[PDB]
Amino acid sequence: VEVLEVKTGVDSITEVECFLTPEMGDPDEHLRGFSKSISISDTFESDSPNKDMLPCYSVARIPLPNLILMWEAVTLKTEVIGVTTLMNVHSNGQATHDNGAAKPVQGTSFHFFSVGGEALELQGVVFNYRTTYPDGTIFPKNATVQSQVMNTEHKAYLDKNKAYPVECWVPDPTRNENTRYFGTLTGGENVPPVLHITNTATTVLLDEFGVGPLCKGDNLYLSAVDVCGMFTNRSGSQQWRGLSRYFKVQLRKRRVK
Amino acid sequence: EVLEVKTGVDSITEVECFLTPEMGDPDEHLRGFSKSISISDTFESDSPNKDMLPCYSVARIPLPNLNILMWEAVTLKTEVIGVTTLMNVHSNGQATHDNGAAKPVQGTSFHFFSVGGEALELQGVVFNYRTTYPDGTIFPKNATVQSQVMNTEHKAYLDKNKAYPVECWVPDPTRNENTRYFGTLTGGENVPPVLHITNTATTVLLDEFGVGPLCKGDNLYLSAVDVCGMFTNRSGSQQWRGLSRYFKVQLRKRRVK
Amino acid sequence: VEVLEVKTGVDSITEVECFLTPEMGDPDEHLRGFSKSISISDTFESDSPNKDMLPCYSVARIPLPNLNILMWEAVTLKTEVIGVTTLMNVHSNGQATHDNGAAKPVQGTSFHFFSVGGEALELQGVVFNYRTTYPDGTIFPKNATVQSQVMNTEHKAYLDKNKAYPVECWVPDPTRNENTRYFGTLTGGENVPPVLHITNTATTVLLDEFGVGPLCKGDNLYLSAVDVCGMFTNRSGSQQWRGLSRYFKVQLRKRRVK
Amino acid sequence: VEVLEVKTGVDSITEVECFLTPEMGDPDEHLRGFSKSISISDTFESDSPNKDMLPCYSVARIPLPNLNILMWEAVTLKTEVIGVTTLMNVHSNGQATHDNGAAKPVQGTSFHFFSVGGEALELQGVVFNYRTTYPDGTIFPKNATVQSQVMNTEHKAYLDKNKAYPVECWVPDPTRNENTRYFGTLTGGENVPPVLHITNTATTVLLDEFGVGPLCKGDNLYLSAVDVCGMFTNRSGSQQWRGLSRYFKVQLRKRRVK
Amino acid sequence: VEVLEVKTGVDSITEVECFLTPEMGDPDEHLRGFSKSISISDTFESDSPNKDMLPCYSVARIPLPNLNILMWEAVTLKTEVIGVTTLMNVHSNGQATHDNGAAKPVQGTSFHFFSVGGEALELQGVVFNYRTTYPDGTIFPKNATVQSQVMNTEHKAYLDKNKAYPVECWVPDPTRNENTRYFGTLTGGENVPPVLHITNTATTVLLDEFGVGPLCKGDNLYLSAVDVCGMFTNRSGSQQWRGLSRYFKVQLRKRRVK
Ligand SMILES: CC(=O)N[C@H]1[C@H](O[C@@H]2[C@H](O[C@]3(C(=O)O)C[C@H](O)[C@@H](NC(C)=O)[C@H]([C@H](O)[C@H](O)CO)O3)[C@@H](O)[C@H](O[C@H]3[C@H](O)[C@@H](O)[C@H](O)O[C@@H]3CO)O[C@@H]2CO)O[C@H](CO)[C@H](O)[C@@H]1O
Ligand SMILES: CC(=O)N[C@H]1[C@H](O[C@@H]2[C@H](O[C@]3(C(=O)O)C[C@H](O)[C@@H](NC(C)=O)[C@H]([C@H](O)[C@H](O)CO)O3)[C@@H](O)[C@H](O[C@H]3[C@H](O)[C@@H](O)[C@H](O)O[C@@H]3CO)O[C@@H]2CO)O[C@H](CO)[C@H](O)[C@@H]1O
Ligand SMILES: CC(=O)N[C@H]1[C@H](O[C@@H]2[C@H](O[C@]3(C(=O)O)C[C@H](O)[C@@H](NC(C)=O)[C@H]([C@H](O)[C@H](O)CO)O3)[C@@H](O)[C@H](O)O[C@@H]2CO)O[C@H](CO)[C@H](O)[C@@H]1O
Ligand SMILES: [K+]
Ligand SMILES: [K+]
Ligand SMILES: [K+]
Ligand SMILES: [K+]
Ligand SMILES: [K+]
Ligand SMILES: [K+]
Ligand SMILES: [K+]
């Protein structure tokens, strides 16, 4: 794939604008955006989380106008949608002290997004190799104790929505040359969410040679995780809470050989 | 079609004003404060009182009558007014320990401002779709479980002061081409306020093509939220505390086709 | 005044170097730099802080070499909080953080503020609680109404007197102050750790977007400061604000005006 | 070595891509990436940590294509911590943060460190407590004296063996290492939250102020790392260090030397 | 001194490389790098710290190659705290953070400070409490008055002796020190986590706004440091300051003066 000149003319550009909903587990008909309450196994070997307790990666494959030319992704604007929902501190949460407001959403967060010309490539890593991941999820198979640090057998494509659990997969840094990805894990049970919004910020997707992701088969791949923290119920039980992510991507036509 | 800027001394003007916060104002003595926060007994029964809900602030400022020319907003200076009030730790708050001073205002904050040539466009998102928002507020209608992450039916304009609750609306990232907005949510009950003031900092409002918000009908729209945290009363009850926001906007005349 | 050219050559520049002591309340002959211990009113309506419990803005007016139209124009500032290491005294009748521990250090709500101007800093009054009774001997927002809790434009003043304007009820007026440059940070929370940087290598430029610094009316330079570092906790649990002095070095040049 | 011109042409560049596994102690066949539970000595004098309780430096010596005078010069690095999302497993024999809550996540003291060099990382020994008896199967500061608690120039070593040099008693020697680029952050405190960023868009340039990167003696590239992310607390409250692997991609070019 | 041109040629540059050990109090033969456990006086007036409980500034005077009019001009600095990983020893007679947990790590109030000059660092005395009795064997502000708690211009000194000038009662004098560059951060709070960065890729330029570095009078370079990292808590709860050494590498060039 030798990359040649960019096309010009009114017809040579296009935009993709959409949102990815979060996939936190959705334990019942009222709990879109939440996981099942989190329970703790008594031993490493008995860790067997329910599917509805596991946040998963979000992904959308977006068809582009049919076109050798390829759409090249050049810029991104992105935003977490609904940040102010975390100000609801009145909905049967757990009072921080006698007569106080409910404890707000807080604790471990993972905020991640990617834009590529093909599926995000994943490497499996597990906290505990004896965790049994549930039916309906796609997970590192044949996990060994080495899978707790690095097992090169665990290679996958993020090719299905609400299927790849966040905790056992990361972007594969050995691959992904045709994707740009960005993430932050902020740990701790008390860490405060810090969520910025603005319509004035643009990320340039071009690599060090001036080339953006090139869309194979005229498809653009967007992926996201926005686990904002956990909601604490009055009882003390805790559920992951997630939010949607907005994407606006500008593309141009690029000739290749 | 945006054409050239008009020059000459007659071609520039300035807007200077402040927006007061709209925190709920539960009685005649409590401007700047919400009603004390109560917690529902069940998730489904969440039903906040109007005076417990901080709302977006908005001001529409009339500009010198033109006429096609339009005022174009170019720069902003902005500041929270009265940051030092949070040093009042002697006004029947809750002692941090025996014989100590009162706990200062702290916890969840939302600091937000926008400048636009028309009303800020809003997208509704709710923490809990079974929350009953109260009479006298404008809130996402026909909320469903999908409203907890993204329901595109919930579109609105910030066109009325003390009416749109902060917790269920955000700037719509799919619109707002003629507005510049900026916000930060910092969550957590112990989050310290960090408030900077200076008259030496300017934000440039021009987009990537060198064009600022263009003021339709010669009106400038300013919006803000500055929920600084919660004040904790001696009894333990907690009220949101907000402050006013200063705006200085410089505008120039722009020809459009 | 139209601002014309800068004057060059011998005697066309000068420097001001000084320090401003903090005004925290000074409740007795031994307690310069501290406030009185903070007490809490029994009701919201009855808030009535004693003068010696209220930190105040510091101000100094510095006479410049007499001119004459030429005016002194403030171009750069170096500034520093003086005595930052005093906060390492954790052995002087404080409250142990746990059994056998060192004393809790100074921490909690801070306000670090400084300004340089060619005239008095202009202030806007805002009060946490409009029914607070501010004490005799302080200058405070008069005829406060419930609107004063958010913004009452009647409360305009000049920082024209030292140890008089309480920090908690006045801020720089952003609608004025065109001939002053001001900078401040409020960091709230009872446990916030002080973070205090010192260096003699950092310079702030005071020139506005047109290349013009504060122009000193009557050949006087106005310097203002607040450096409430936090609270000291006594063994008994009582808390006192603690402040430190601020150093200023300002370079000025002569500017012709019409 | 006098440094002369860079070689050009298709054959003049090469790249190294690999990962280094963490070496946290691996106390049993199920606990790769963890240390043994941390125990506390009764006295300073009796401090005597078992090997499987001591995280160690990771190192790989990577042979490069043979050249011989030309040397491979390391010019850029991309690096990443692998498996950051594993820390979201808060359902696996941990300790509930409060009644009915999720498990306490990995948190507390972290050290994130990496280096790229044309020879082994040079180390200086420094010990918290000179009376610590370091265990069989580790390489540690020898003939430690009280001065070893601050600086004893006898403790010089090379990071030349994997899972051997304990993190707590060795640092990069700032008096040497001119042919290595190293970077590290120790973030202390028992409750500090991990903050782990990932991206494939960030490059670090390895060139010094003269435009010269590490030069690979004998055509070997030396990569070193520590990524102690914090401690995992199990249900009983016992704590174990948890580490993760680090990815490296290094671009190199041929450089002539005399 | 009128500053004229820089000398060039291979012989016109030199380097100083060294380390300064911390001076934390060293209460016994086994506790180099630590202070005595911290105690708390029963009244503000009775504060009377023992010498071994007080960290002091470190200083080294480094002779340079003899010149005479030429002076050595300090141009760049690389500096690093040595032994950051020692803070990973959480198994040595500390206090478990909770049942079965590891020892609480070094944390709480830190002061990290360094300076490079062509003469002794100039100090200003400021005291937390003017009634503190500083011990024999230290050099401290004399004839302290209540004003010494904020600024008493009598307390001027030179940092001209090791193990002598307590950190808590002296700071760099911002009204002087024109021939020195100094940098420091006080981070307060009993639970503040240490954040210690190491790298050999970072250089600080020591030139002022006129392109002139410190000029070394009598061909001596003066380096000063404080690196109080926090406090170590022993099993009983008693707390001691812990410090680490600091590396300095300074590049100098010959400068003609009149
Ligand atoms: C306290 C408890 O039993 N927790 C169970 C959980 O039980 C459900 C519900 O508990 C809560 C909770 O965890 O505190 C109430 C809370 O308001 C809910 N929050 C939200 C945002 O929806 C959560 C949440 O739905 C789940 O945790 C998600 O997994 O649920 C109980 O109050 C409820 O109690 C019923 C009794 O079981 C029943 O005998 C009696 O007739 O009626 C009461 C009241 O309805 O039961 C709920 C389950 O049916 O269930 C989860 C299962 O995922 C766990 O077992 C928790 O431990
Ligand atoms: C303690 C309590 O009853 N709290 C009620 C609250 O009652 C009001 C007031 O309480 C406080 C409080 O919440 O602690 C006192 C506090 O100083 C106030 N703070 C400020 C900044 O104004 C708050 C605040 O105004 C409200 O929380 C705002 O929503 O209010 C009580 O002290 C007061 O008690 C009176 C009795 O009602 C009355 O029978 C008796 O004769 O006199 C006492 C003393 O005046 O009543 C206040 C209400 O009238 O009310 C709120 C609802 O607004 C909640 O019900 C709290 O739970
Ligand atoms: C314990 C007590 O009675 N406190 C009241 C106080 O009495 C003081 C003094 O108490 C202390 C205190 O704990 O508040 C002792 C402290 O060491 C001292 N600290 C410093 C830095 O000076 C403080 C301080 O002087 C005041 O709090 C400043 O306002 O005082 C107590 O030991 C002694 O018996 O009487 C003293 C009064 O002369 O007084 C304050 C107001 O002045 C309050 O009334 C306290 O409740
Ligand atoms: K299992
Ligand atoms: K309801
Ligand atoms: K009153
Ligand atoms: K031993
Ligand atoms: K060296
Ligand atoms: K004394
Ligand atoms: K001076």
Side-chain angles (χ1 to χ4, degrees), chain A residues 3-9 11-256, chain B residues 2-9 11-176 178-256, chain C residues 3-9 12-257, chain D residues 2-234 236-257, chain E residues 2-257:
Chain A
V3 172
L4 302 166
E5 75 286 346
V6 170
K7 307 295 97 172
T8 64
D11 310 276
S12 54
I13 58 177
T14 196
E15 296 190 2
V16 161
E17 195 172 31
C18 67
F19 59 91
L20 270 54
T21 50
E23 299 300 339
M24 298 297 102
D26 302 339
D28 78 13
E29 71 202 295
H30 309 288
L31 289 176
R32 187 83 166 116
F34 297 80
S35 76
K36 196 187 198 272
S37 49
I38 297 158
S39 51
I40 307 161
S41 70
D42 287 332
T43 62
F44 270 22
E45 66 168 3
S46 69
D47 188 29
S48 282
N50 269 19
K51 180 171 181 271
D52 58 346
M53 203 188 78
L54 291 176
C56 291
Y57 281 85
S58 297
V59 53
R61 183 179 60 75
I62 309 289
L64 304 166
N66 178 228
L67 307 173
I68 313 158
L69 304 179
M70 302 183 79
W71 286 111
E72 175 183 10
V74 173
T75 68
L76 170 70
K77 293 189 146 176
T78 188
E79 180 137 301
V80 176
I81 307 168
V83 300
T84 56
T85 60
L86 308 195
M87 301 196 81
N88 182 336
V89 294
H90 46 77
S91 188
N92 198 41
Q94 196 179 68
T96 56
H97 59 259
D98 282 356
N99 301 315
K103 179 194 281 185
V105 170
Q106 65 188 252
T108 299
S109 67
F110 185 58
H111 292 283
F112 169 84
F113 57 92
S114 66
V115 181
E118 61 193 78
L120 176 70
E121 292 165 290
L122 303 171
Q123 166 68 55
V125 191
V126 293
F127 189 70
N128 160 17
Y129 83 100
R130 291 175 292 168
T131 298
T132 303
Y133 288 100
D135 192 72
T137 66
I138 303 167
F139 51 80
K141 287 190 268 185
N142 299 320
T144 64
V145 75
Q146 296 312 319
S147 308
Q148 291 174 178
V149 298
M150 249 304 299
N151 186 336
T152 57
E153 176 177 342
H154 308 316
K155 302 293 190 190
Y157 298 107
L158 172 53
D159 58 10
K160 190 182 177 176
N161 194 53
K162 72 156 83 87
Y164 292 86
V166 178
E167 72 174 57
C168 56
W169 298 106
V170 287
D172 186 350
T174 69
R175 303 180 183 184
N176 285 303
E177 282 194 296
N178 196 38
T179 287
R180 307 299 174 257
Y181 71 80
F182 312 84
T184 298
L185 186 299
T186 305
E189 69 270 27
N190 297 141
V191 293
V194 182
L195 308 170
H196 306 289
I197 59 173
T198 183
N199 65 344
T200 68
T202 297
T203 296
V204 176
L205 297 176
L206 304 184
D207 66 13
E208 60 262 47
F209 308 108
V211 191
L214 296 174
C215 295
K216 291 173 173 156
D218 306 328
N219 288 304
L220 178 67
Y221 291 76
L222 308 180
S223 319
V225 180
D226 288 286
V227 172
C228 293
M230 290 169 193
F231 180 59
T232 304
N233 293 298
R234 179 190 297 278
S235 71
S237 71
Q238 296 185 297
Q239 306 171 243
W240 299 112
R241 180 63 154 108
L243 295 172
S244 299
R245 179 176 282 279
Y246 168 77
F247 285 80
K248 183 189 139 197
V249 176
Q250 302 170 310
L251 308 99
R252 62 183 181 201
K253 295 181 185 178
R254 173 78 86 147
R255 184 164 67 95
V256 303
Chain B
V2 184
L3 301 173
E4 79 283 339
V5 170
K6 302 277 139 144
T7 64
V9 184
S11 64
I12 60 168
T13 194
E14 297 199 345
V15 166
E16 199 170 20
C17 64
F18 58 88
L19 273 58
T20 49
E22 303 295 344
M23 298 293 105
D25 301 349
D27 71 23
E28 73 203 289
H29 308 294
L30 289 173
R31 189 88 181 104
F33 291 86
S34 75
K35 186 163 193 286
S36 56
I37 297 154
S38 54
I39 305 171
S40 66
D41 290 342
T42 68
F43 203 70
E44 182 274 334
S45 61
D46 191 30
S47 192
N49 279 20
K50 179 171 189 281
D51 48 358
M52 209 184 79
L53 291 179
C55 290
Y56 280 83
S57 294
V58 55
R60 175 175 66 74
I61 313 295
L63 301 175
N65 179 37
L66 301 174
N67 313 298
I68 309 165
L69 304 178
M70 303 180 75
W71 291 108
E72 176 187 8
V74 178
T75 70
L76 168 71
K77 292 186 156 172
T78 188
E79 183 144 297
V80 181
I81 306 169
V83 300
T84 57
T85 59
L86 308 191
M87 304 192 78
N88 182 336
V89 289
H90 43 78
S91 190
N92 199 41
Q94 193 172 68
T96 51
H97 57 259
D98 285 355
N99 306 317
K103 191 199 238 184
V105 169
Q106 62 186 255
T108 302
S109 72
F110 187 57
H111 291 290
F112 171 84
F113 54 91
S114 66
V115 178
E118 57 195 80
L120 179 69
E121 289 163 287
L122 300 171
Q123 166 65 57
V125 193
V126 295
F127 186 69
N128 171 5
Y129 87 97
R130 292 170 292 168
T131 301
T132 305
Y133 287 101
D135 178 62
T137 64
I138 300 162
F139 51 84
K141 297 190 193 185
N142 307 317
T144 61
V145 73
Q146 298 308 323
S147 312
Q148 281 172 183
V149 301
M150 248 311 292
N151 179 342
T152 64
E153 168 169 347
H154 309 313
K155 304 293 194 187
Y157 299 109
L158 184 48
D159 60 4
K160 189 176 178 182
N161 202 46
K162 57 162 154 282
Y164 293 83
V166 178
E167 69 176 54
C168 57
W169 298 107
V170 288
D172 186 349
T174 70
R175 309 189 176 173
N176 287 302
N178 199 32
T179 289
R180 311 292 177 260
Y181 69 82
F182 313 83
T184 305
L185 184 299
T186 311
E189 68 267 28
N190 302 137
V191 157
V194 181
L195 304 168
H196 301 293
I197 61 175
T198 182
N199 64 344
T200 63
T202 302
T203 293
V204 175
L205 301 170
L206 304 184
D207 67 14
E208 60 268 41
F209 307 108
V211 185
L214 299 168
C215 297
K216 297 175 172 167
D218 308 327
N219 290 303
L220 181 64
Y221 281 81
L222 311 170
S223 318
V225 183
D226 291 281
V227 172
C228 297
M230 296 179 190
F231 178 60
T232 300
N233 295 299
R234 177 187 294 270
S235 72
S237 64
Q238 290 183 300
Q239 306 169 243
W240 298 110
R241 184 52 156 110
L243 296 171
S244 299
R245 183 170 279 281
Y246 167 81
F247 288 78
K248 187 196 298 190
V249 176
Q250 296 174 304
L251 305 99
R252 69 192 173 190
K253 297 179 185 174
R254 173 80 81 148
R255 189 160 67 88
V256 305
Chain C
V3 182
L4 302 175
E5 78 285 340
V6 171
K7 302 311 199 78
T8 62
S12 74
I13 60 177
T14 196
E15 301 202 329
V16 158
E17 197 166 23
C18 67
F19 60 89
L20 272 61
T21 52
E23 300 298 338
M24 297 294 101
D26 299 347
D28 75 21
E29 70 200 33
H30 307 292
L31 287 172
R32 187 100 173 95
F34 295 77
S35 79
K36 182 178 183 81
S37 51
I38 294 156
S39 51
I40 305 171
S41 65
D42 287 338
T43 71
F44 200 69
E45 184 276 325
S46 67
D47 190 33
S48 192
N50 288 352
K51 184 175 182 277
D52 52 344
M53 208 186 84
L54 292 175
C56 290
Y57 282 84
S58 300
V59 53
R61 176 174 67 73
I62 310 287
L64 300 167
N66 177 29
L67 303 176
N68 314 305
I69 315 160
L70 301 181
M71 302 178 81
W72 286 113
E73 177 189 8
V75 180
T76 68
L77 171 68
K78 295 187 146 169
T79 185
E80 183 140 298
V81 181
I82 306 170
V84 298
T85 54
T86 63
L87 308 193
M88 299 190 70
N89 183 337
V90 289
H91 46 80
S92 180
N93 207 34
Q95 192 174 63
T97 49
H98 59 265
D99 288 351
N100 298 323
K104 187 195 270 182
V106 167
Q107 64 184 239
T109 299
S110 70
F111 188 56
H112 293 284
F113 172 82
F114 56 89
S115 65
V116 179
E119 56 189 86
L121 179 67
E122 290 159 299
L123 301 174
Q124 167 66 56
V126 192
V127 294
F128 188 70
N129 170 7
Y130 87 99
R131 292 167 295 165
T132 301
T133 303
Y134 283 101
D136 177 57
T138 66
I139 300 170
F140 52 86
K142 300 186 213 190
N143 304 320
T145 60
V146 73
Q147 296 311 315
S148 309
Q149 288 175 178
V150 301
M151 249 305 296
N152 178 336
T153 59
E154 178 184 338
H155 310 317
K156 303 303 194 179
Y158 296 103
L159 177 52
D160 57 12
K161 190 174 179 186
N162 198 55
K163 48 162 156 275
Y165 291 87
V167 178
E168 70 170 55
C169 55
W170 300 107
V171 291
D173 184 352
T175 74
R176 305 180 177 185
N177 283 307
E178 288 209 59
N179 197 34
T180 288
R181 305 297 174 264
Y182 71 83
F183 312 86
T185 301
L186 187 292
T187 307
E190 72 266 26
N191 302 135
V192 303
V195 178
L196 305 170
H197 303 288
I198 57 173
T199 183
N200 64 343
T201 65
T203 299
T204 301
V205 179
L206 302 174
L207 302 185
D208 68 11
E209 54 270 46
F210 306 104
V212 191
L215 295 168
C216 295
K217 295 173 174 174
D219 305 332
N220 290 303
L221 182 64
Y222 284 76
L223 305 175
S224 316
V226 183
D227 290 286
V228 176
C229 295
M231 295 175 189
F232 180 61
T233 299
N234 295 303
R235 188 179 282 277
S236 69
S238 62
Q239 296 178 296
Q240 292 167 256
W241 298 109
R242 180 57 151 114
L244 294 171
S245 303
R246 181 169 285 274
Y247 165 83
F248 291 77
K249 182 176 104 144
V250 179
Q251 301 177 312
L252 305 102
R253 64 193 177 191
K254 300 180 180 177
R255 175 74 87 151
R256 185 162 70 90
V257 306
Chain D
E2 180 177 316
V3 182
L4 300 170
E5 75 283 339
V6 173
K7 309 288 96 180
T8 59
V10 190
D11 311 72
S12 65
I13 62 173
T14 197
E15 77 160 36
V16 161
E17 199 178 22
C18 63
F19 63 88
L20 272 56
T21 54
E23 304 297 346
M24 300 293 103
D26 306 338
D28 74 24
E29 73 198 51
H30 306 300
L31 288 173
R32 182 74 165 130
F34 295 78
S35 79
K36 182 144 103 217
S37 299
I38 294 154
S39 53
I40 307 167
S41 71
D42 297 327
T43 53
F44 254 26
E45 158 65 62
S46 72
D47 190 27
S48 183
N50 282 178
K51 180 179 179 173
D52 61 5
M53 205 188 79
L54 294 173
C56 289
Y57 281 87
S58 296
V59 54
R61 175 177 65 76
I62 310 289
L64 306 170
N66 177 89
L67 296 182
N68 307 292
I69 306 163
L70 300 179
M71 298 180 79
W72 285 109
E73 177 184 14
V75 180
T76 70
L77 169 72
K78 296 189 145 178
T79 189
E80 185 140 295
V81 176
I82 312 173
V84 304
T85 59
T86 60
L87 307 193
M88 302 191 81
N89 186 338
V90 294
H91 48 82
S92 183
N93 197 40
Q95 191 178 60
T97 46
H98 58 261
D99 287 5
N100 300 321
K104 187 200 263 191
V106 166
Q107 59 186 255
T109 301
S110 67
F111 185 58
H112 289 285
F113 171 84
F114 54 90
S115 66
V116 178
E119 58 193 83
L121 180 68
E122 292 164 293
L123 299 171
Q124 167 69 53
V126 192
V127 298
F128 188 69
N129 164 13
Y130 83 106
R131 288 174 293 177
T132 297
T133 300
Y134 285 103
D136 278 8
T138 64
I139 302 176
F140 52 81
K142 307 279 263 168
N143 303 322
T145 63
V146 71
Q147 301 310 322
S148 306
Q149 286 171 184
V150 298
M151 250 300 304
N152 179 334
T153 61
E154 176 180 332
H155 312 313
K156 298 304 187 177
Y158 300 106
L159 178 50
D160 57 13
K161 186 176 183 173
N162 195 55
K163 64 176 92 202
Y165 291 85
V167 177
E168 69 170 57
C169 57
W170 302 108
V171 290
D173 184 353
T175 71
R176 301 180 182 183
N177 284 306
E178 284 194 285
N179 195 31
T180 288
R181 307 295 177 261
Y182 69 80
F183 309 86
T185 298
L186 182 304
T187 310
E190 68 271 34
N191 296 146
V192 294
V195 179
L196 306 170
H197 308 289
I198 58 175
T199 183
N200 64 342
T201 69
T203 301
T204 295
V205 177
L206 297 177
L207 305 184
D208 70 13
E209 59 272 37
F210 305 108
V212 185
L215 298 172
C216 297
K217 295 176 180 164
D219 307 322
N220 293 298
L221 180 69
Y222 285 78
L223 304 177
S224 310
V226 182
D227 291 283
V228 171
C229 297
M231 293 173 189
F232 174 63
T233 306
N234 69 39
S236 75
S238 62
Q239 292 181 297
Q240 307 172 268
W241 296 111
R242 181 57 155 110
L244 297 168
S245 299
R246 182 172 279 280
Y247 170 78
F248 286 79
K249 191 179 86 147
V250 177
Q251 300 171 329
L252 304 103
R253 64 186 177 194
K254 295 178 191 180
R255 172 78 83 146
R256 188 160 71 87
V257 304
Chain E
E2 185 191 353
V3 182
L4 302 164
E5 76 282 345
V6 169
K7 301 298 99 183
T8 59
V10 176
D11 309 70
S12 58
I13 67 177
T14 196
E15 303 195 346
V16 160
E17 192 167 25
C18 70
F19 62 84
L20 274 57
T21 52
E23 302 298 338
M24 298 294 106
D26 296 349
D28 73 22
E29 72 203 295
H30 309 291
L31 284 174
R32 184 93 168 107
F34 294 80
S35 79
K36 181 143 189 209
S37 58
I38 294 157
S39 51
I40 309 164
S41 75
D42 265 0
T43 72
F44 212 58
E45 189 277 332
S46 68
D47 189 34
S48 193
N50 292 355
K51 180 176 157 89
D52 63 355
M53 200 186 80
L54 294 171
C56 290
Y57 280 84
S58 300
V59 56
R61 178 180 66 79
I62 313 291
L64 300 169
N66 176 75
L67 289 186
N68 315 278
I69 312 163
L70 305 179
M71 302 183 78
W72 286 113
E73 175 190 7
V75 178
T76 68
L77 170 70
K78 291 188 158 174
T79 185
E80 183 146 294
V81 175
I82 307 168
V84 299
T85 58
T86 60
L87 305 197
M88 296 192 71
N89 185 341
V90 295
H91 48 78
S92 181
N93 203 41
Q95 187 182 66
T97 49
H98 58 268
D99 290 359
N100 301 321
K104 181 197 272 189
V106 170
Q107 64 187 243
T109 303
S110 66
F111 189 54
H112 291 286
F113 170 85
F114 58 87
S115 67
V116 182
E119 57 195 83
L121 182 66
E122 292 163 292
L123 298 174
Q124 165 70 53
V126 194
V127 295
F128 190 70
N129 166 18
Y130 85 101
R131 291 171 290 166
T132 298
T133 301
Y134 286 100
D136 206 81
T138 61
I139 301 171
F140 53 81
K142 297 187 155 211
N143 308 309
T145 62
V146 72
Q147 301 311 324
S148 309
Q149 285 171 182
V150 293
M151 251 304 302
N152 182 333
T153 57
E154 164 168 6
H155 311 313
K156 304 292 188 181
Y158 300 102
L159 178 51
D160 57 14
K161 191 184 165 153
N162 215 42
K163 309 182 192 277
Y165 289 86
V167 178
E168 73 169 51
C169 60
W170 297 108
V171 289
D173 184 352
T175 69
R176 299 179 183 188
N177 284 306
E178 288 201 56
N179 193 39
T180 288
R181 308 298 174 258
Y182 68 82
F183 310 85
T185 304
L186 182 298
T187 307
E190 65 270 31
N191 303 137
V192 301
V195 181
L196 307 175
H197 301 290
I198 59 175
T199 182
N200 65 341
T201 64
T203 304
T204 298
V205 183
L206 301 175
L207 302 185
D208 69 9
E209 62 267 44
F210 307 112
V212 184
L215 301 169
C216 294
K217 294 172 179 174
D219 304 324
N220 291 303
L221 180 66
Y222 287 79
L223 308 173
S224 312
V226 180
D227 292 285
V228 173
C229 294
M231 297 175 181
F232 174 63
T233 304
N234 88 1
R235 178 185 321 276
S236 67
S238 62
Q239 289 183 299
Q240 302 168 265
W241 299 109
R242 179 60 157 111
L244 297 167
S245 297
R246 182 173 284 273
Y247 167 80
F248 291 76
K249 181 194 170 202
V250 179
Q251 301 179 314
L252 308 101
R253 62 193 180 187
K254 293 181 192 168
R255 174 75 90 146
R256 185 162 70 93
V257 304

